[PDB]
Amino acid sequence: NKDAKPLLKEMKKSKEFYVIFDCSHETAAEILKQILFMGMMTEYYHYFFTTLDLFALDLELYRYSGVNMTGFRLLNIDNPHVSSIIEKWSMERLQAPPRPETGLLDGMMTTEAAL
């Protein structure tokens, strides 16, 4: 659980910009925080996560202004039933005691809970 700053330093020195991050939710959160901290926010990179939860985790579209992030999403939306269920999840989460924000948002479905 350390920083992979050298690996990306050679990766950028190798005239290569297109890297795939196979990782878990914890590791995904920590790597995203590290890459944002270092300054990897330009339009000369393209990143992808194999983790299926990227809508119930702390992702903000306004931090992204130069970098392109694309991903997979197991869940299906635009279903009124799935909607009503997601408001039920949010309303049952909000009154509950707050949970730490360590790279995980509450009020939205996660994969294991849904399955």
Next chain:
Amino acid sequence: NKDAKPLLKEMKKSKEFYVIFDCSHETAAEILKQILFMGMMTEYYHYFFTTLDLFALD
């Protein structure tokens, strides 16, 4: 100054790298964080603060 993203986004679009920030100590506080927000932090840029204080700010 909290929403200075437009001016700087055309300044980066016009490909200028060397800028002098005429600014007050109040303004430095938010500019040092917008420079993080917009997503341009490459070494090609060159920056200068007119204020005499750099040991009171992070």
